[PDB]
Amino acid sequence: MAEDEGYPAEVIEIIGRTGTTGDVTQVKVRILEGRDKGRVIRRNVRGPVRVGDILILRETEREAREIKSRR
């Protein structure tokens, strides 16, 4: 319906837990539409999930901290 300012992604498969940051949960989702339509990525969010979930990625962030420490 014209609306294309955000491409929703449906969970295709769950990876598991992440923790560290705070009981994080990484899951893989695929683009339902938006040119690409068919792009699987790995988004990290807090809380569980269930195959079917849908969420738009207005940015998806990145967070390229890259701890200089590196030990």
Side-chain angles (χ1 to χ4, degrees), residues 13-28:
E13 178 142 82
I14 307 153
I15 299 138
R17 218 129 156 155
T18 287
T20 287
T21 276
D23 304 85
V24 174
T25 287
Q26 250 268 48
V27 290
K28 269 183 176 91

PDB file of all heavy atoms in Angstrom, residues 13-28:
ATOM      1  N   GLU A  13      14.715 -18.597  11.637  1.00  0.00           N
ATOM      2  CA  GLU A  13      15.299 -19.563  12.552  1.00  0.00           C
ATOM      3  C   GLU A  13      15.986 -18.846  13.716  1.00  0.00           C
ATOM      4  O   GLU A  13      16.590 -17.791  13.529  1.00  0.00           O
ATOM      5  CB  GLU A  13      16.276 -20.488  11.824  1.00  0.00           C
ATOM      6  CG  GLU A  13      16.927 -21.474  12.796  1.00  0.00           C
ATOM      7  CD  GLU A  13      17.096 -22.850  12.151  1.00  0.00           C
ATOM      8  OE1 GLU A  13      18.064 -23.073  11.407  1.00  0.00           O
ATOM      9  OE2 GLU A  13      16.177 -23.706  12.444  1.00  0.00           O
ATOM     10  N   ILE A  14      15.872 -19.447  14.891  1.00  0.00           N
ATOM     11  CA  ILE A  14      16.475 -18.878  16.084  1.00  0.00           C
ATOM     12  C   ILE A  14      17.868 -19.479  16.282  1.00  0.00           C
ATOM     13  O   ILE A  14      18.062 -20.679  16.095  1.00  0.00           O
ATOM     14  CB  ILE A  14      15.550 -19.058  17.290  1.00  0.00           C
ATOM     15  CG1 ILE A  14      14.148 -18.525  16.990  1.00  0.00           C
ATOM     16  CG2 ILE A  14      16.151 -18.419  18.542  1.00  0.00           C
ATOM     17  CD1 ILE A  14      13.094 -19.246  17.833  1.00  0.00           C
ATOM     18  N   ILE A  15      18.801 -18.617  16.659  1.00  0.00           N
ATOM     19  CA  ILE A  15      20.170 -19.048  16.885  1.00  0.00           C
ATOM     20  C   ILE A  15      20.297 -19.607  18.303  1.00  0.00           C
ATOM     21  O   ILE A  15      20.602 -20.784  18.485  1.00  0.00           O
ATOM     22  CB  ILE A  15      21.147 -17.909  16.583  1.00  0.00           C
ATOM     23  CG1 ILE A  15      21.041 -17.469  15.122  1.00  0.00           C
ATOM     24  CG2 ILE A  15      22.576 -18.297  16.964  1.00  0.00           C
ATOM     25  CD1 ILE A  15      21.096 -15.945  15.003  1.00  0.00           C
ATOM     26  N   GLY A  16      20.057 -18.736  19.272  1.00  0.00           N
ATOM     27  CA  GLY A  16      20.140 -19.128  20.669  1.00  0.00           C
ATOM     28  C   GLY A  16      20.223 -17.901  21.579  1.00  0.00           C
ATOM     29  O   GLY A  16      19.551 -16.899  21.339  1.00  0.00           O
ATOM     30  N   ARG A  17      21.053 -18.020  22.605  1.00  0.00           N
ATOM     31  CA  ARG A  17      21.232 -16.933  23.553  1.00  0.00           C
ATOM     32  C   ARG A  17      22.496 -16.139  23.217  1.00  0.00           C
ATOM     33  O   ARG A  17      23.276 -16.542  22.355  1.00  0.00           O
ATOM     34  CB  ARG A  17      21.335 -17.462  24.985  1.00  0.00           C
ATOM     35  CG  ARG A  17      20.612 -16.536  25.964  1.00  0.00           C
ATOM     36  CD  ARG A  17      19.639 -17.323  26.845  1.00  0.00           C
ATOM     37  NE  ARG A  17      19.394 -16.590  28.107  1.00  0.00           N
ATOM     38  CZ  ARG A  17      18.275 -16.721  28.853  1.00  0.00           C
ATOM     39  NH1 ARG A  17      17.290 -17.559  28.469  1.00  0.00           N
ATOM     40  NH2 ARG A  17      18.162 -16.017  29.965  1.00  0.00           N
ATOM     41  N   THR A  18      22.660 -15.025  23.915  1.00  0.00           N
ATOM     42  CA  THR A  18      23.816 -14.171  23.701  1.00  0.00           C
ATOM     43  C   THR A  18      24.410 -13.733  25.041  1.00  0.00           C
ATOM     44  O   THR A  18      25.623 -13.795  25.236  1.00  0.00           O
ATOM     45  CB  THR A  18      23.382 -12.999  22.818  1.00  0.00           C
ATOM     46  OG1 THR A  18      23.214 -13.581  21.527  1.00  0.00           O
ATOM     47  CG2 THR A  18      24.496 -11.970  22.620  1.00  0.00           C
ATOM     48  N   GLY A  19      23.528 -13.301  25.931  1.00  0.00           N
ATOM     49  CA  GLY A  19      23.952 -12.853  27.247  1.00  0.00           C
ATOM     50  C   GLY A  19      25.012 -11.756  27.138  1.00  0.00           C
ATOM     51  O   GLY A  19      24.976 -10.942  26.216  1.00  0.00           O
ATOM     52  N   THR A  20      25.931 -11.770  28.092  1.00  0.00           N
ATOM     53  CA  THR A  20      27.000 -10.785  28.116  1.00  0.00           C
ATOM     54  C   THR A  20      26.428  -9.381  28.314  1.00  0.00           C
ATOM     55  O   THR A  20      26.511  -8.821  29.407  1.00  0.00           O
ATOM     56  CB  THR A  20      27.809 -10.935  26.826  1.00  0.00           C
ATOM     57  OG1 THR A  20      28.544 -12.141  27.015  1.00  0.00           O
ATOM     58  CG2 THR A  20      28.887  -9.860  26.683  1.00  0.00           C
ATOM     59  N   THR A  21      25.859  -8.851  27.242  1.00  0.00           N
ATOM     60  CA  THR A  21      25.272  -7.522  27.285  1.00  0.00           C
ATOM     61  C   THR A  21      24.146  -7.469  28.319  1.00  0.00           C
ATOM     62  O   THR A  21      23.992  -6.473  29.024  1.00  0.00           O
ATOM     63  CB  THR A  21      24.815  -7.161  25.870  1.00  0.00           C
ATOM     64  OG1 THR A  21      25.990  -6.647  25.246  1.00  0.00           O
ATOM     65  CG2 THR A  21      23.838  -5.984  25.852  1.00  0.00           C
ATOM     66  N   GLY A  22      23.388  -8.554  28.377  1.00  0.00           N
ATOM     67  CA  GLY A  22      22.280  -8.644  29.314  1.00  0.00           C
ATOM     68  C   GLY A  22      21.231  -9.646  28.828  1.00  0.00           C
ATOM     69  O   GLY A  22      20.177  -9.255  28.330  1.00  0.00           O
ATOM     70  N   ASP A  23      21.557 -10.920  28.990  1.00  0.00           N
ATOM     71  CA  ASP A  23      20.656 -11.982  28.574  1.00  0.00           C
ATOM     72  C   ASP A  23      20.084 -11.649  27.195  1.00  0.00           C
ATOM     73  O   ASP A  23      18.869 -11.668  27.002  1.00  0.00           O
ATOM     74  CB  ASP A  23      19.486 -12.125  29.550  1.00  0.00           C
ATOM     75  CG  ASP A  23      19.885 -12.365  31.007  1.00  0.00           C
ATOM     76  OD1 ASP A  23      20.160 -11.418  31.758  1.00  0.00           O
ATOM     77  OD2 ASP A  23      19.907 -13.603  31.369  1.00  0.00           O
ATOM     78  N   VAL A  24      20.986 -11.350  26.272  1.00  0.00           N
ATOM     79  CA  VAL A  24      20.587 -11.013  24.917  1.00  0.00           C
ATOM     80  C   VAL A  24      20.196 -12.291  24.172  1.00  0.00           C
ATOM     81  O   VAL A  24      20.611 -13.385  24.549  1.00  0.00           O
ATOM     82  CB  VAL A  24      21.704 -10.233  24.219  1.00  0.00           C
ATOM     83  CG1 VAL A  24      21.372 -10.000  22.745  1.00  0.00           C
ATOM     84  CG2 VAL A  24      21.978  -8.909  24.936  1.00  0.00           C
ATOM     85  N   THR A  25      19.401 -12.109  23.127  1.00  0.00           N
ATOM     86  CA  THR A  25      18.949 -13.234  22.325  1.00  0.00           C
ATOM     87  C   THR A  25      19.048 -12.902  20.836  1.00  0.00           C
ATOM     88  O   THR A  25      18.333 -12.032  20.341  1.00  0.00           O
ATOM     89  CB  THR A  25      17.532 -13.596  22.774  1.00  0.00           C
ATOM     90  OG1 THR A  25      17.718 -14.224  24.040  1.00  0.00           O
ATOM     91  CG2 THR A  25      16.904 -14.687  21.906  1.00  0.00           C
ATOM     92  N   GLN A  26      19.941 -13.612  20.162  1.00  0.00           N
ATOM     93  CA  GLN A  26      20.143 -13.404  18.738  1.00  0.00           C
ATOM     94  C   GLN A  26      19.245 -14.344  17.931  1.00  0.00           C
ATOM     95  O   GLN A  26      19.173 -15.538  18.218  1.00  0.00           O
ATOM     96  CB  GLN A  26      21.613 -13.591  18.359  1.00  0.00           C
ATOM     97  CG  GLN A  26      22.259 -12.254  17.989  1.00  0.00           C
ATOM     98  CD  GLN A  26      22.161 -11.997  16.484  1.00  0.00           C
ATOM     99  OE1 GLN A  26      21.114 -12.130  15.872  1.00  0.00           O
ATOM    100  NE2 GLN A  26      23.307 -11.622  15.924  1.00  0.00           N
ATOM    101  N   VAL A  27      18.583 -13.770  16.938  1.00  0.00           N
ATOM    102  CA  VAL A  27      17.692 -14.542  16.088  1.00  0.00           C
ATOM    103  C   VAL A  27      17.888 -14.115  14.631  1.00  0.00           C
ATOM    104  O   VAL A  27      18.272 -12.978  14.360  1.00  0.00           O
ATOM    105  CB  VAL A  27      16.248 -14.388  16.566  1.00  0.00           C
ATOM    106  CG1 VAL A  27      16.034 -15.102  17.903  1.00  0.00           C
ATOM    107  CG2 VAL A  27      15.856 -12.912  16.664  1.00  0.00           C
ATOM    108  N   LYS A  28      17.615 -15.049  13.732  1.00  0.00           N
ATOM    109  CA  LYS A  28      17.756 -14.785  12.311  1.00  0.00           C
ATOM    110  C   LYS A  28      16.376 -14.518  11.707  1.00  0.00           C
ATOM    111  O   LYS A  28      15.436 -15.278  11.936  1.00  0.00           O
ATOM    112  CB  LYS A  28      18.518 -15.921  11.627  1.00  0.00           C
ATOM    113  CG  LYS A  28      20.022 -15.642  11.611  1.00  0.00           C
ATOM    114  CD  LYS A  28      20.776 -16.744  10.864  1.00  0.00           C
ATOM    115  CE  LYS A  28      22.267 -16.417  10.764  1.00  0.00           C
ATOM    116  NZ  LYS A  28      23.002 -16.992  11.914  1.00  0.00           N
TER     117      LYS A  28
END
